[PDB]
Design an enzyme around this catalytic site. Structure first.
Site, PDB file in Angstrom:
ATOM      1  N   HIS A  61       0.799  -1.220   0.000  1.00 16.51           N
ATOM      2  CA  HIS A  61       0.000   0.000   0.000  1.00 16.51           C
ATOM      3  C   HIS A  61       0.834   1.272   0.000  1.00 16.51           C
ATOM      4  O   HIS A  61       0.307   2.333  -0.348  1.00 16.51           O
ATOM      5  CB  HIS A  61      -0.997   0.049   1.174  1.00 16.51           C
ATOM      6  CG  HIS A  61      -0.398  -0.152   2.530  1.00 16.51           C
ATOM      7  ND1 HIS A  61      -0.238  -1.402   3.090  1.00 16.51           N
ATOM      8  CD2 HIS A  61       0.015   0.736   3.466  1.00 16.51           C
ATOM      9  CE1 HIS A  61       0.283  -1.277   4.299  1.00 16.51           C
ATOM     10  NE2 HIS A  61       0.443   0.010   4.552  1.00 16.51           N
ATOM     11  N   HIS A  91       6.985   6.728   5.822  1.00 19.17           N
ATOM     12  CA  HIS A  91       6.367   6.294   4.572  1.00 19.17           C
ATOM     13  C   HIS A  91       5.692   7.512   3.952  1.00 19.17           C
ATOM     14  O   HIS A  91       5.641   8.589   4.564  1.00 19.17           O
ATOM     15  CB  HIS A  91       5.336   5.162   4.777  1.00 19.17           C
ATOM     16  CG  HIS A  91       4.210   5.543   5.692  1.00 19.17           C
ATOM     17  ND1 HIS A  91       4.268   5.390   7.065  1.00 19.17           N
ATOM     18  CD2 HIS A  91       3.053   6.201   5.440  1.00 19.17           C
ATOM     19  CE1 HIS A  91       3.159   5.867   7.607  1.00 19.17           C
ATOM     20  NE2 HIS A  91       2.413   6.380   6.644  1.00 19.17           N
ATOM     21  N   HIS A  93       2.268   9.078   1.379  1.00 17.28           N
ATOM     22  CA  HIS A  93       0.998   8.979   0.672  1.00 17.28           C
ATOM     23  C   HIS A  93       1.086   9.934  -0.505  1.00 17.28           C
ATOM     24  O   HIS A  93       1.608  11.037  -0.347  1.00 17.28           O
ATOM     25  CB  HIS A  93      -0.146   9.399   1.593  1.00 17.28           C
ATOM     26  CG  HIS A  93      -0.247   8.562   2.826  1.00 17.28           C
ATOM     27  ND1 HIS A  93      -0.931   7.367   2.861  1.00 17.28           N
ATOM     28  CD2 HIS A  93       0.405   8.658   4.012  1.00 17.28           C
ATOM     29  CE1 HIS A  93      -0.797   6.822   4.059  1.00 17.28           C
ATOM     30  NE2 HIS A  93       0.030   7.576   4.768  1.00 17.28           N
ATOM     31  N   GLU A 103      -3.033  13.486   2.855  1.00 15.50           N
ATOM     32  CA  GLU A 103      -4.165  13.010   3.635  1.00 15.50           C
ATOM     33  C   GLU A 103      -4.796  14.150   4.419  1.00 15.50           C
ATOM     34  O   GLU A 103      -6.000  14.387   4.304  1.00 15.50           O
ATOM     35  CB  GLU A 103      -3.749  11.873   4.575  1.00 15.50           C
ATOM     36  CG  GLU A 103      -3.248  10.658   3.807  1.00 15.50           C
ATOM     37  CD  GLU A 103      -3.277   9.382   4.623  1.00 15.50           C
ATOM     38  OE1 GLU A 103      -2.668   9.274   5.725  1.00 15.50           O
ATOM     39  OE2 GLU A 103      -3.957   8.465   4.123  1.00 15.50           O
ATOM     40  N   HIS A 116       4.920  10.789   6.458  1.00 16.63           N
ATOM     41  CA  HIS A 116       4.592  10.441   7.837  1.00 16.63           C
ATOM     42  C   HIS A 116       5.806   9.810   8.490  1.00 16.63           C
ATOM     43  O   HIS A 116       6.309   8.788   8.014  1.00 16.63           O
ATOM     44  CB  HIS A 116       3.387   9.499   7.904  1.00 16.63           C
ATOM     45  CG  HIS A 116       2.100  10.162   7.499  1.00 16.63           C
ATOM     46  ND1 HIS A 116       0.983   9.458   7.084  1.00 16.63           N
ATOM     47  CD2 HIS A 116       1.739  11.468   7.503  1.00 16.63           C
ATOM     48  CE1 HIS A 116       0.009  10.307   6.810  1.00 16.63           C
ATOM     49  NE2 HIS A 116       0.438  11.533   7.066  1.00 16.63           N
ATOM     50  N   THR A 195      -4.230   6.286   9.815  1.00 19.13           N
ATOM     51  CA  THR A 195      -5.057   6.468   8.625  1.00 19.13           C
ATOM     52  C   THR A 195      -5.088   5.215   7.762  1.00 19.13           C
ATOM     53  O   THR A 195      -5.685   5.226   6.675  1.00 19.13           O
ATOM     54  CB  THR A 195      -4.566   7.628   7.761  1.00 19.13           C
ATOM     55  OG1 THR A 195      -3.297   7.283   7.199  1.00 19.13           O
ATOM     56  CG2 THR A 195      -4.443   8.944   8.588  1.00 19.13           C
TER      57      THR A 195
HETATM   58  C1  LIG Z   1       2.694   2.401   6.385  1.00 21.32           C
HETATM   59  O1  LIG Z   1       1.670   3.003   7.139  1.00 21.32           O
HETATM   60  C2  LIG Z   1       1.680   2.735   8.527  1.00 21.32           C
HETATM   61  C3  LIG Z   1       2.395   1.689   9.074  1.00 21.32           C
HETATM   62  C4  LIG Z   1       2.332   1.498  10.470  1.00 21.32           C
HETATM   63  C5  LIG Z   1       3.061   0.442  11.016  1.00 21.32           C
HETATM   64  N1  LIG Z   1       2.991   0.205  12.383  1.00 21.32           N
HETATM   65  C6  LIG Z   1       3.752  -0.907  12.980  1.00 21.32           C
HETATM   66  C7  LIG Z   1       2.975  -1.886  13.911  1.00 21.32           C
HETATM   67  C8  LIG Z   1       1.581  -1.870  14.091  1.00 21.32           C
HETATM   68  C9  LIG Z   1       0.947  -2.776  14.964  1.00 21.32           C
HETATM   69  O2  LIG Z   1      -0.447  -2.838  15.204  1.00 21.32           O
HETATM   70  C10 LIG Z   1      -1.305  -1.994  14.481  1.00 21.32           C
HETATM   71  C11 LIG Z   1       1.708  -3.701  15.652  1.00 21.32           C
HETATM   72  O3  LIG Z   1       1.067  -4.604  16.517  1.00 21.32           O
HETATM   73  C12 LIG Z   1       0.377  -5.625  15.857  1.00 21.32           C
HETATM   74  C13 LIG Z   1       3.084  -3.732  15.492  1.00 21.32           C
HETATM   75  O4  LIG Z   1       3.829  -4.692  16.200  1.00 21.32           O
HETATM   76  C14 LIG Z   1       5.185  -4.665  15.850  1.00 21.32           C
HETATM   77  C15 LIG Z   1       3.713  -2.838  14.626  1.00 21.32           C
HETATM   78  C16 LIG Z   1       2.233   1.084  13.149  1.00 21.32           C
HETATM   79  C17 LIG Z   1       1.507   2.148  12.577  1.00 21.32           C
HETATM   80  C18 LIG Z   1       1.591   2.315  11.256  1.00 21.32           C
HETATM   81  C19 LIG Z   1       0.851   3.379  10.692  1.00 21.32           C
HETATM   82  C20 LIG Z   1       0.928   3.545   9.318  1.00 21.32           C
HETATM   83  O5  LIG Z   1       0.219   4.524   8.621  1.00 21.32           O
HETATM   84  S1  LIG Z   1      -0.210   5.969   9.282  1.00 21.32           S
HETATM   85  N2  LIG Z   1      -0.736   6.825   7.925  1.00 21.32           N
HETATM   86  O6  LIG Z   1      -1.427   5.775  10.328  1.00 21.32           O
HETATM   87  O7  LIG Z   1       1.124   6.621   9.919  1.00 21.32           O
HETATM   88 ZN   LIG Z   2       0.694   7.451   6.715  1.00 27.44          ZN
END
Ligand SMILES: COc1cc2c[n+](Cc3cc(OC)c(OC)c(OC)c3)ccc2cc1OS(N)(=O)=O
Ligand SMILES: [Zn+2]
EC number: 4.2.1.1
Length: 257
Positions: A61, A91, A93, A103, A116, A195
């Site tokens: 994505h 990352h 968008h 966003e 972000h 998001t």
């Molecule tokens: C690539 O986009 C994203 C990747 C993300 C990746 N993570 C990592 C993550 C997320 C997790 O749960 C949601 C975990 O527990 C299951 C985890 O354990 C290691 C690691 C967290 C938030 C993120 C938010 C992201 O998008 S955003 N737009 O809300 O900053």
């Molecule tokens: Zn993001």
């Protein structure tokens, strides 16, 4: 499974992730005339001199650069935050046209992309615990507009050929994220969510006022990534942004007048 297409895009996410209709969803439109200057907000403290980047990954994505978060090397503190937040990844968008892709919006204005930088509150020990907490994550958001090239982004641009399809990754060491920051650290802040699914409402958003410029040649290389895996029908990775959500019972605060 979720994505940004006609049949699985943001308007569908609530069926798998009911919190999509929650009380503190992101992104939002920032209305600059109803945001509130808060003089009690501290300046941001961004300490990235010790950052250790590890790898760059097409996750189907977006693409992301991951950092070593086993120590307090690259941290964010100050602003509206209590405590220390470690940098995990960044990352982007972006859009199919230069008039869309961000966003967050500012007085309904869309930018060409949004960066972000994702940080997690070390109080909770690991990012998995942090996403279960109201103050678990802090995401620093930076707008990109098309104009002059940003030299500090070119090392990212030059490696995108090697992660064209979902699941490809590459070594990506010694990248300094300070090259991606605007001159000013003035910001808006509000409580929000991821998001992307699972859309957890665990984020303190910090959105910088000042966009960075990138060249048309730089952003065009984003648009040549693929959502699909290799050997699947080709689908350009564009418009991987969630539209603005209702502000509901929230106040956007500004650090600048
Ligand atoms: C690539 O986009 C994203 C990747 C993300 C990746 N993570 C990592 C993550 C997320 C997790 O749960 C949601 C975990 O527990 C299951 C985890 O354990 C290691 C690691 C967290 C938030 C993120 C938010 C992201 O998008 S955003 N737009 O809300 O900053
Ligand atoms: Zn993001």
């Amino acid at each position: 499974h979720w994505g940004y297409g006609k049949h699985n895009g943001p308007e569908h996410w609530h069926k798998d992730f009911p919190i999509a209709k929650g009380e503190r969803q992101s992104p939002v439109d920032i209305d600059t005339h109803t945001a509130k200057y808060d003089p009690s907000l501290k300046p941001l403290s961004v300490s990235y001199d010790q950052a250790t980047s590890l790898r760059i990954l097409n996750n189907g994505h977006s693409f992301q650069v991951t950092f070593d978060d086993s120590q307090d090397k690259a941290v964010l503190k100050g602003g509206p935050l209590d405590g220390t937040y470690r940098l995990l990844q960044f990352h982007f968008h972006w859009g199919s046209l230069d008039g869309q892709g961000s966003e967050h919006t500012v007085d309904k204005k869309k930018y060409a992309a949004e960066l972000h930088l994702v940080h997690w509150n070390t109080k909770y020990g690991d990012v998995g615990k942090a996403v279960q907490q109201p103050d678990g994550l802090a995401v620093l958001g930076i707008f990109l507009k098309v104009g002059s090239a940003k030299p500090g982004l070119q090392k990212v641009v030059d490696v995108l050929d090697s992660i064209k399809t979902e699941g490809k990754s590459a070594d990506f060491t010694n990248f300094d994220p300070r090259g991606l920051l605007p001159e000013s650290l003035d910001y808006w802040t509000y409580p929000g969510s991821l998001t992307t699914p699972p859309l957890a409402e665990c984020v303190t958003w910090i959105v910088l006022k000042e966009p960075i410029s990138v060249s048309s040649e730089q952003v065009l290389k984003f648009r040549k990534l693929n959502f699909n895996g290799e050997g699947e029908p080709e689908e350009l990775m564009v418009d991987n942004w969630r539209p603005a959500q209702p502000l509901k019972n929230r106040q956007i605060k500004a650090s600048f007048k």
